[PDB]
Amino acid sequence: EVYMRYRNFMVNSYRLNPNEYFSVTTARRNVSGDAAALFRLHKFLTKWG
Amino acid sequence: IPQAHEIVIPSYSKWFNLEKIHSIEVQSLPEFFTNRIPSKTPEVYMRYRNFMVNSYRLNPNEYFSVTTARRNVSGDAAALFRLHKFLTKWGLINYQVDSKLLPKNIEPPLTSQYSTRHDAPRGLFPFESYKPSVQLPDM
Amino acid sequence: TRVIPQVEVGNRKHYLEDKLKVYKQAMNETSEQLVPIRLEFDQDRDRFFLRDTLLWNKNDKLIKIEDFVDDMLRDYRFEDATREQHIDTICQSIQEQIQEFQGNPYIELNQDRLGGDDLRIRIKLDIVVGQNQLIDQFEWDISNSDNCPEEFAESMCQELELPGEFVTAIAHSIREQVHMYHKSLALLGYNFDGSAIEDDDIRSRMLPTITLDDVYRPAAESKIFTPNLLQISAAELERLDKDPDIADIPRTFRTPVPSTLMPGGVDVGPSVESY
Amino acid sequence: PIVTEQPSAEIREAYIENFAKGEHISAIVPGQSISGTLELSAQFRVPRYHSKNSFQQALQMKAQYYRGLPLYEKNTLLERLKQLTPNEIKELEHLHDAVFVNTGLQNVRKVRTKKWKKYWQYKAGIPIGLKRSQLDEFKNKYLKDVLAKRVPNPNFLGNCNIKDFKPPYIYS
Amino acid sequence: KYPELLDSLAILGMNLLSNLSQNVVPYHRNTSDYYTQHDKMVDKIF
């Protein structure tokens, strides 16, 4: 459940402006958790398109 | 002689009664019953619960928030948070409030109903000739 | 015709990790010890200025702090020279705070009494996201391992209609002050069983018993234990920008991140209009 | 007035360039958010149903809706408050505080949710307050957008680099 | 300049060998291919 929460947050928030790089600092600042897992999830996402 | 109200309770919450502690409460909120802590007594638990439920029933279509509980009643804030959540679970709190009036997260909207295009490599689709009939032959 | 190893996204290379180490850590994990990390750098000191708060899992062997800091400095759109100069200072700052985080005493020393003791402190907030400033104060018990700051911060920010910046700032502040008290207690001789606080500067900061007739709060105090979101002018904004002890508790004023959408960030970016 | 970003792009750009260097600038650049405050306790206060010395004297003698409260009737009311005990007045004050603050928070919640919807619309590039009926007009507005030079990106509705490749059974 | 590529190939090969030895076919599987303690105590009591 937490995984889907974080992932959908990141994807929804990116697709509102595709021209701009969606960074790890904004996700780290807007959702609560340890920065390492958020780093890993952000890299997975940005890796698979 | 006193003025009357009318409130609603889910049918599975009839066990709840003031002046009384039920076993469901004892096994749901174990902190207020371990006889080690002088502050967390069943007497003060009953007062927390009564304050919250009464002040909600004074106007049943206004969402009772843990912020006011924290403001009026002295005690640990997370204990009041857990008690508020338990009360909301078993009906018994904010049942009548209209949905769309409940609090919600401030998040970007959903993008699930969007149309996406796919970027494909070169040799993924075959080359095709022969436009086929698409019409029945005359006989 | 070429062979291109990859195309850079945001002027960066893709991150490639070791999957055996990933599974090795994931399949032997037990706890999630979290460290509150605070970064503060002025200009009339080391050349750059930067402020941030963060949570880091200490039982983490997968991500190197140097990579994390390099990525973070790329997110703030620092020039190449400045990043290559100051990544070392930032990495040392982050690496020190992890080492002095001994941990949660009631866990490393098995106490876990299902209600904890009654050590209760006052947690005070001062968070300046945007042009607003949230000031709040509430009681928090630090003996109970059931108290989760994330859920509490999320609930408060739902009930006041605040964005996620406040959520993470509040969670970090709660954890920071709780750990300050844990550390000040364990620094002096205190076995965390058999309360017997046995001190004077603290035991004067804990909150008294609640027996009864003390459950209801006076009116002069009810004004203190209530949240306020005060919006501040440009002058006080600039003042707040310019300017283990328990007396002074650090505030939170992060430098904005260059994001077009999110609240609390600056809008220096490729516009939503696509021209 | 809804959003609070610094309105001039030049100062934001200069700020971020000097920040990339490491230096400060003169002007202030705060982060984006909606405007508005929540000044609780500079607001509804605890009612004092008691007088100054009522409780100590009681100790020595040993004893529709307006905001959240419904409206009362004089005759039936003047009996109920005569029934109750000084030990129960404090509980009354606190229940009334609870209901007042809960109503106030309900109202501010409504206002803030409206303002946040408008903020997200403004940030996403939608004009403002679009109805379900205006969608296609919005698309037509897009045409006007490039006419008012401007050259569209590949991240522009209807300007994708990828185009459909029709099948052989489609004739044209 | 891009080492993970090698891993991919090898890993793919390995799985194929497994599927070949146990008489399994990995493609078009006809399957789906998808997938606080206090609160849990409370709703479990519920």
From Swiss-Prot, chain A:
Interacts with RTT102, SWP82 and the N-terminus of SNF2. Component of the SWI/SNF global transcription activator complex. The 1.14 MDa SWI/SNF complex is composed of 11 different subunits: one copy each of SWI1, SNF2/SWI2, SNF5, SNF12/SWP73, ARP7/SWP61, ARP9/SWP59; two copies each of SWI3, SNF6, SNF11, SWP82; and three copies of TAF14/SWP29. It comes from Saccharomyces cerevisiae (strain ATCC 204508 / S288c). The gene is SWI3. Changing residue 47 to D: Loss of DNA-binding. The lineage of its organism: Eukaryota, Fungi, Dikarya, Ascomycota, Saccharomycotina. It is found in: Nucleus. The chain holds residues 341 to 389 of 825 of the full protein. Involved in transcriptional activation. Component of the SWI/SNF complex, an ATP-dependent chromatin-remodeling complex, which is required for the positive and negative regulation of gene expression of a large number of genes. It changes chromatin structure by altering DNA-histone contacts within a nucleosome, leading eventually to a change in nucleosome position, thus facilitating or repressing binding of gene-specific transcription factors. It comes from the Eukaryota. This is SWI/SNF complex subunit SWI3. Present with 3150 molecules/cell in log phase SD medium.
UniProtKB/Swiss-Prot annotation, chain C:
It is found in: Nucleus. Involved in transcriptional activation. Component of the SWI/SNF complex, an ATP-dependent chromatin-remodeling complex, which is required for the positive and negative regulation of gene expression of a large number of genes. It changes chromatin structure by altering DNA-histone contacts within a nucleosome, leading eventually to a change in nucleosome position, thus facilitating or repressing binding of gene-specific transcription factors. Component of the SWI/SNF global transcription activator complex. The 1.14 MDa SWI/SNF complex is composed of 11 different subunits: one copy each of SWI1, SNF2/SWI2, SNF5, SNF12/SWP73, ARP7/SWP61, ARP9/SWP59; two copies each of SWI3, SNF6, SNF11, SWP82; and three copies of TAF14/SWP29. Present with 217 molecules/cell in log phase SD medium. Belongs to the SNF5 family. This is SWI/SNF chromatin-remodeling complex subunit SNF5. It comes from Saccharomyces cerevisiae (strain ATCC 204508 / S288c). The gene is SNF5. The chain holds residues 424 to 752 of 905 of the full protein.
From Swiss-Prot, chain D:
Keywords: Activator, Chromatin regulator, Nucleus, Transcription, Transcription regulation. It is found in: Nucleus. One of its GO terms (cellular component) is RSC-type complex. Interacts with SWI3 and SNF12. Component of the SWI/SNF global transcription activator complex. The 1.14 MDa SWI/SNF complex is composed of 11 different subunits: one copy each of SWI1, SNF2/SWI2, SNF5, SNF12/SWP73, ARP7/SWP61, ARP9/SWP59; two copies each of SWI3, SNF6, SNF11, SWP82; and three copies of TAF14/SWP29. Present with 3180 molecules/cell in log phase SD medium. Belongs to the RSC7/SWP82 family. SWP82 subfamily. This is SWI/SNF global transcription activator complex subunit SWP82. It comes from Saccharomyces cerevisiae (strain ATCC 204508 / S288c). The chain holds residues 275 to 569 of 623 of the full protein.
Swiss-Prot record, chain E:
Belongs to the SWI1 family. It comes from the Eukaryota. Involved in transcriptional activation. Component of the SWI/SNF complex, an ATP-dependent chromatin remodeling complex, which is required for the positive and negative regulation of gene expression of a large number of genes. It changes chromatin structure by altering DNA-histone contacts within a nucleosome, leading eventually to a change in nucleosome position, thus facilitating or repressing binding of gene-specific transcription factors. The prion domain (PrD) is a Gln/Asn (Q/N)-rich domain, which is unstructured in its native, soluble form, and which forms a parallel in-register beta-sheet in its amyloid form. The first 37 residues of this domain are sufficient for aggregation, propagation, and transmission of the [SWI+] prion. Component of the SWI/SNF global transcription activator complex. The 1.14 MDa SWI/SNF complex is composed of 11 different subunits: one copy each of SWI1, SNF2/SWI2, SNF5, SNF12/SWP73, ARP7/SWP61, ARP9/SWP59; two copies each of SWI3, SNF6, SNF11, SWP82; and three copies of TAF14/SWP29. It is found in: Nucleus. The chain holds residues 744 to 800 of 1314 of the full protein. This is SWI/SNF chromatin-remodeling complex subunit SWI1.
